[PDB]
Design a protein around this ligand. Structure first.
Ligand SMILES: Cc1cc2nc3c(=O)[nH]c(=O)nc-3n(C[C@H](O)[C@H](O)[C@H](O)COP(=O)(O)OP(=O)(O)OC[C@H]3O[C@@H](n4cnc5c(N)ncnc54)[C@H](O)[C@@H]3O)c2cc1C
Ligand SMILES: CC1(C)c2[nH]c3ccccc3c2C[C@@]23CN4CCC[C@]4(C[C@@H]12)C(=O)N3
Ligand SMILES: CC1(C)c2[nH]c3ccccc3c2C[C@@]23CN4CCC[C@]4(C[C@@H]12)C(=O)N3
Ligand SMILES: [Cl-]
Ligand SMILES: [Zn+2]
Length: 664
């Protein structure tokens, strides 16, 4: 495809504001419709996942308008995504060759556990992603992902209006398909608000809970909660001075310690780019995805920046997520002038390994505009008690949230988004096909499983977070108990079978394994023991002994019961085939490599000879995956064959669950 500069030229020709050039790509047009089936408040990632999944699940059935108050896709924290998310992208027609032009490569999760009372000591837990011919995971800049999903939505009959705000004071939401009247303005100053008459409202306003907070107060869990503070840093090409052995920048890296943990995420940034130019670049990438352009013939990230007049750079997202029962010194003005800055630099110098690590990174000033060098957010975890009701439902963060750790936010949260997308078709049709009282009753009953799933979802994620946090207080519990159980219970068994039709059903069965019984039994023994040791104390060695032995005893039976064949010793660096810990083990599969030219991390596959980020040609041999233990040519061919394309929908197939096989 020859690249078009439609939006760049349209914007210049009419001197269009940012929201005006975006809204001009709507199928219905730049202005709001009088009527719609579904109005979605908020075009965060979940508002857009919802609209894309709803229209793709059953095309040309629902008219859907998304209202987003940001004039353009705004900054958001929450950048790490997982195989289920990529699979969802691939099911919606965008595979890794195209996604990697926009987003950073993620190849598994690695953890380093720092000893507090013995500064310099650490242990690790390392896993891998997948071969480039199986799948990828992504590190996404959220203004870019929201742009990609806006454009994809508009190309699929969904209207998306930026710079428009739902007025939750004058909006009327009523049940039984009688009719919502959603008030949409450009802000509180706006004299001329519009109304969209509609059947269903979707609250996707995130943590702001702008609608469902009117139906129930925010709910907090017992015990400590968490705070976060973070910033953006350079991404070094040469990672060899990082003080951890075998560190790799294309993992989501976790630096863990008694008070909490630090995320390290390498991802490219498009900040400084004009919005119209970005629309042309994204539109071109989708046209390339439509045409099936091979990766080696697709222009590199940097070439796209030159082609469309964009700004491109590599940055590292580094942040703290710590408990809110930590004791800070009263005076912290030696570490900065803002609180977020102060607590960040204070915590860095509390750990010699953190200070040594951070000394490889240079701080970026105001990457996302003024005032954005530092971020802080306090009291992270919460739950919405009421997530649906007559005329409305809520998705994503508006239902609840726990912690950045293991990225439940996007990757687990999309179970609600996609299930709600599927549920919306009968909800609207019920309203159009039955009188009001019966419609409201039938819809209420239809939504009981959605309400009940949501009600139980956040508490299970909360216990998962506390399980990991308490085990992060010891350098043996962290890797050998918490991480081991998360990956065993939460690895996505049978993901290669998921399609558009089964996706919501599969996703709600995942929950990162947090509902698995043996997982909760180990999680409860650990939490019950460790929560009785004050944070400023070291866990007694006998307590670690007892917990480690308990976990390994439950583990052996649950592992034996699982009927899913996995090369566990190839996927977890520190464990053998039966998930036994091996003290010195170091052998794992190798799926990635770092570009000698630009530093970007690449997936190994024979048909990707050039770097997708800068276009530099690597040597042919480098494209060879290393399987340890080895695979035959047939075993390798059989692997890649399973992951080529998703299966057609068979209404007689039993859905195979991601969680491990029950013992019974
Ligand atoms: C420190 C931290 C780190 C995290 N890291 C990760 C991670 O690595 N991976 C991960 O998966 N998750 C992560 N999360 C969680 C993640 O950020 C959220 O789960 C995710 O962004 C939820 O997005 P959403 O679409 O639900 O809401 P949001 O992205 O918050 O979108 C809400 C939207 O609603 C709009 N809006 C609000 N009011 C109105 C109105 N009246 N009219 C119109 N529009 C309105 C806002 O402008 C906004 O665009 C992290 C969270 C935190 C706090
Ligand atoms: C299931 C998968 C998405 C996955 N989910 C994880 C969760 C936590 C830690 C590691 C993983 C992995 C690595 C896997 C294991 N599978 C072996 C055959 C195909 C596949 C898919 C992929 C692979 O190549 N790598
Ligand atoms: C298992 C089932 C009760 C179910 N449980 C859910 C939970 C959440 C969301 C959706 C579902 C569904 C829909 C299913 C999926 N199954 C495919 C083969 C037979 C069956 C039974 C039924 C079917 O036809 N529809
Ligand atoms: Cl993650
Ligand atoms: Zn390169």
């Amino acid at each position: 495809p020859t690249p078009k500069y439609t939006f760049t030229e349209r914007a210049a020709a009419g001197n269009l504001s940012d929201a005006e050039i975006l809204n001009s790509n709507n199928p219905t047009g730049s202005e709001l419709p009088d009527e719609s089936d579904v109005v979605v408040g908020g075009a965060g990632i979940h508002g857009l996942i919802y609209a894309l999944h709803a229209s793709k699940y059953k095309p040309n059935n629902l008219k859907i308008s998304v209202i987003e108050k940001n004039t353009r896709p705004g900054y958001k924290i929450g950048e790490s995504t997982l195989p289920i998310f990529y699979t969802w992208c691939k099911l919606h027609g965008i595979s890794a060759a195209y996604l990697l032009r926009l987003f950073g490569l993620k190849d598994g999760l690695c953890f380093y556990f720092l000893d507090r009372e013995n500064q310099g000591q650490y242990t690790d837990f390392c896993s891998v992603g997948a071969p480039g011919l199986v799948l990828a995971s992504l590190q996404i800049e959220r203004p870019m992902s929201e742009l990609l999903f806006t454009i994809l939505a508009q190309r699929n009959g969904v209207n998306v209006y930026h710079g428009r705000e739902v007025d939750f004071k004058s909006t009327v939401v009523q049940g039984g398909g009688q009719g919502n009247k959603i008030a949409v303005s450009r802000g509180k100053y706006d004299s001329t608000p519009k109304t969209i008459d509609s059947a269903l409202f979707v609250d996707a306003t995130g943590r702001f809970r702008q609608f469902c907070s009117k139906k129930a107060p925010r709910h907090r869990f017992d015990g400590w909660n968490c705070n976060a503070f973070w910033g953006y840093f350079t991404a070094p090409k040469d990672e060899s001075k990082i003080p951890f052995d075998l560190y790799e920048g294309d993992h989501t890296n976790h630096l863990c310690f008694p008070e909490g943990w630090v995320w390290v995420i390498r991802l490219p940034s498009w900040e400084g780019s004009p919005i119209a130019n970005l629309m042309d670049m994204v539109t071109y990438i989708l046209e390339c995805a439509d045409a099936g352009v091979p990766g080696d013939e697709l222009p590199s990230s940097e070439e796209l920046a030159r082609m469309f007049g964009l700004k491109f750079q590599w940055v590292t997202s580094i942040g703290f997520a710590v408990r809110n029962d930590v004791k800070y010194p009263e005076d912290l003005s030696a570490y900065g002038t803002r609180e977020a800055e102060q607590k960040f630099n204070y915590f860095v110098q509390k750990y010699e390994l953190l200070q040594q690590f951070m000394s490889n990174f240079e701080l970026i000033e105001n990457l996302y505009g003024p005032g954005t060098t530092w971020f802080i957010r306090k009291t992270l975890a919460y739950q919405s008690p009421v997530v649906s009701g007559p005329g409305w439902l809520a998705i994503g963060d508006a239902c609840g949230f726990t912690n950045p750790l293991y990225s439940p936010g996007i990757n687990v949260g999309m179970s609600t988004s996609t299930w709600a997308a599927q549920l919306s078709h009968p909800i609207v049709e019920i309203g159009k096909s039955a009188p009001a009282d019966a419609a409201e009753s039938s819809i209420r009953k239809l939504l009981v499983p959605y309400d009940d799933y949501c009600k139980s979802l956040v508490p299970a994620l909360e216990q998962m977070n506390r399980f990991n946090y308490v085990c992060y207080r010891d350098t043996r519990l962290g890797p050998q108990v918490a991480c081991l159980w998360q990956f065993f219970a939460g690895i996505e068994r049978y993901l290669s079978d998921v399609n558009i039709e089964t996706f919501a059903h599969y996703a709600i069965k995942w929950v990162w394994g947090a509902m698995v019984p043996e997982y909760q039994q180990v999680a409860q023994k650990c939490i019950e023991h460790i929560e009785t040791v004050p944070l400023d104390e070291r866990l007694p060695d006998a307590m670690v002994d007892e917990l480690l032995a308990f976990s390994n005893r439950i583990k052996s039976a649950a592992v034996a019961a699982d009927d899913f064949s996995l090369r566990w010793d190839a996927i977890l660096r520190s464990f053998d085939r039966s998930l036994n810990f091996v003290e010195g083990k170091t052998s794992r599969d190798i799926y990635t490599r770092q570009c000698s030219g630009c530093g970007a991390w690449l997936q190994l596959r024979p048909d990707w000879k050039k770097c997708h980020s800068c276009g530099l040609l690597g040597t042919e041999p480098q494209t060879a995956v290393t399987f340890d233990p080895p695979l035959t040519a047939e075993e390798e061919a059989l692997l890649y064959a399973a992951w080529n394309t998703a299966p057609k929908y068979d209404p007689s197939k039993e859905l195979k669950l991601p969680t491990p096989t029950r013992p019974a």
